[PDB]
């Protein structure tokens, strides 16, 4: 799978493919790895689908309780810390790699990456999954400070398409999200909507 | 095959207002026999019988635990147990040990006490109920007696034909496997009476 996140001024962009595989057989070709932990906080899921769904639900539970008892909107650092303690305490059992993104008033748009092993790192742009390997170079080259919402969306779509064409595990339709003070704008790119890149075609 | 350590074979068949249940007699280690009088069919009611094959220690333990639960049930309720109820109890008992299971594959056969309707079933290693209308098997020579019963069995058989059928099936089956044999015992159940017969079989 391939998951990707980018921070723009005043929000973030989340993108992920729709393919989950058991071996070489695609059990679900339309799965949604973007998960709302909270109204303004989202989670992308890589690794064992079971582990990621479980820790996502538990974090949603804890964070809802924390937010409601505080009577203030939660923080992305807080959600990432919860995921961190869970994945670190159960690093042996869980084969899960997470990337958390959301918006909060105190810090604004934030992206945190929780890879396997339960470490937490804030990042401007962060990719994960089997297919992130193939696009590390593309994001290193293409990224620029000060990108906008539409620019970051196109960047994420291009990256995910490039990863999807090469990686067998990644594939399907691209699912995108953009999170900000206003709210969440989700969209799904399929077929011709997905960016295309020319083959060698000798 | 831990099941093949003691061997053994158990079979049941259905008929018109009658059921038949049969089992071999050999108790033996993987190749050495010890006794030709082993009890693999245990009575769980007036006209309800259970038959166990697999590891003999688990056979005995399961029968004892089942009689324990069953006597408690019959005392508390004040009625005889129904066959489907016994099936469910056995499944619960085996699934309680789903890790570290009792290595036995039961077979239950009897008539419903009120309507005297035939019932047969089998359960897997871990308690998967499998009700059928014709026959059920458990043991090492299962593969043999499956085809033997598929051929010989006919619907709505009377007790005579049922006995001849189950006898021919068990004999021609256990003759063809090594670790089972040394005789075979056939219990016939019908509303009025119970009939038990031992068969002449090759003691090789």
């Amino acid at each position: 799978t391939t998951i990707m996140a980018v921070q723009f001024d005043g929000g973030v962009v989340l993108g992920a493919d729709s393919r989950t595989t058991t071996g070489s057989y695609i059990a679900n070709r339309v799965t949604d790895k973007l998960t709302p932990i909270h109204d303004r906080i989202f989670c992308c899921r890589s690794g064992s689908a079971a582990d990621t769904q479980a820790v996502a639900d538990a974090v949603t539970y804890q964070l809802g309780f924390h937010s409601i008892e505080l009577n203030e909107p939660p923080l992305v650092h807080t959600a990432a810390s919860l995921f961190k303690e869970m994945c670190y305490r159960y690093r042996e059992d869980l084969m899960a790699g997470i990337i958390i993104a959301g918006w909060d008033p105190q810090e604004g748009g934030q992206v945190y990456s929780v890879p396997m092993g339960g470490m937490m790192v804030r990042q401007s742009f962060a990719i994960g999954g089997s297919g992130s390997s193939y696009i590390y170079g593309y994001v290193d080259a293409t990224y620029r400070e000060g990108m906008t919402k539409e620019e970051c969306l196109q960047f994420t779509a291009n990256a995910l398409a490039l990863a999807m064409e090469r990686d067998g595990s990644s594939g399907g339709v691209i699912r995108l999200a953009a999170i900000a003070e206003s709210g969440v704008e989700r969209q799904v790119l399929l077929g011709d909507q997905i960016p295309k890149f020319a083959v060698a075609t000798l | 095959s831990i099941m093949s350590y003691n061997g053994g074979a158990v079979m049941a068949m259905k008929g018109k207002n009658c059921v038949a249940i049969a089992a071999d007699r050999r108790f033996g280690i993987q190749a050495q026999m010890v006794t030709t009088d082993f009890q693999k069919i245990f009575p769980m009611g007036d006209r309800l019988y259970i038959g166990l094959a697999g590891l003999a220690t688990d056979v005995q333990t399961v029968a004892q635990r089942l009689k324990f639960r069953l006597n408690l049930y019959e005392l508390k309720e004040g009625r005889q147990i129904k066959p489907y109820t016994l099936m469910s109890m056995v499944a619960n008992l085996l699934y309680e040990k789903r890790f570290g299971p009792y290595y036995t594959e039961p077979v239950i056969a009897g008539l419903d006490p009120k309507t005297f309707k035939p019932f047969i079933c089998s359960l897997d290693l871990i308690g998967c109920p499998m009700v059928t209308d014709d026959f059920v098997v458990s043991g090492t020579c299962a593969e043999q007696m499956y085809g033997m019963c598929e051929s010989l069995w006919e619907p709505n058989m009377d007790p005579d034909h049922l006995f001849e059928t189950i006898s021919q099936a068990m004999l021609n089956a256990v003759d063809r496997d090594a670790v089972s044999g040394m005789g075979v015992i056939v219990h016939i159940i019908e509303k009025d009476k119970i009939t038990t017969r031992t068969l002449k079989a090759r003691m090789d």
Binding site: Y25 | Y95, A142, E164, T196, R197, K200
Partner: protein, 222 residues
Amino acid sequence: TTIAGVVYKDGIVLGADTRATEGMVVADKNCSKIHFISPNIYCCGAGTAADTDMTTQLISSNLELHSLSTGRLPRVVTANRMLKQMLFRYQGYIGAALVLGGVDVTGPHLYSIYPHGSTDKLPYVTMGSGSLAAMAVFEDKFRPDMEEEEAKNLVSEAIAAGIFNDLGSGSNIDLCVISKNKLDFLRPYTVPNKKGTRLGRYRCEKGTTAVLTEKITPLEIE
């Protein structure tokens, strides 16, 4: 084993075969791989049969509690969450692969549950040995918002493909149709394969078998 499910316009159709195999020999030719969870929720099971049966029984119990406590019909997400939490607690050792389907106030919902606790809400799913063939049939001929008859024919074709192309599956097709208002449980919906008639009679006459002992016991009746 081949189980399959699909969402039609106003409900759900579930389908499954009836062949239960211990190894590579058939044990049960008319198994019921469709279980009762609630009046409005049903489930089909594959994998370890005992695990599937006992899990479905457990969740049926808990949902009976929940439903009659609440005074309103149970939901599907409840069952899915119960199942996935249980299966995750056991970490895949209980090998229950389930397709779960039901109709509630929000609408028809169909879930596919894997032994390690994963889930996926889908319009059509297939699990078991014939899952790939059934997926082929669905990816070919599935269309959104099908009528009930079309959905039944599709699921029958899918289960039949799993039957006639997988060794594990066979012997019959079972159907279950859940909707907002009715439930039609069709156990022998189709009989694609039947046993051929026996040409020769091999019935054995009395005295064919020898006996070394006989003991008759009368049963008192009243």
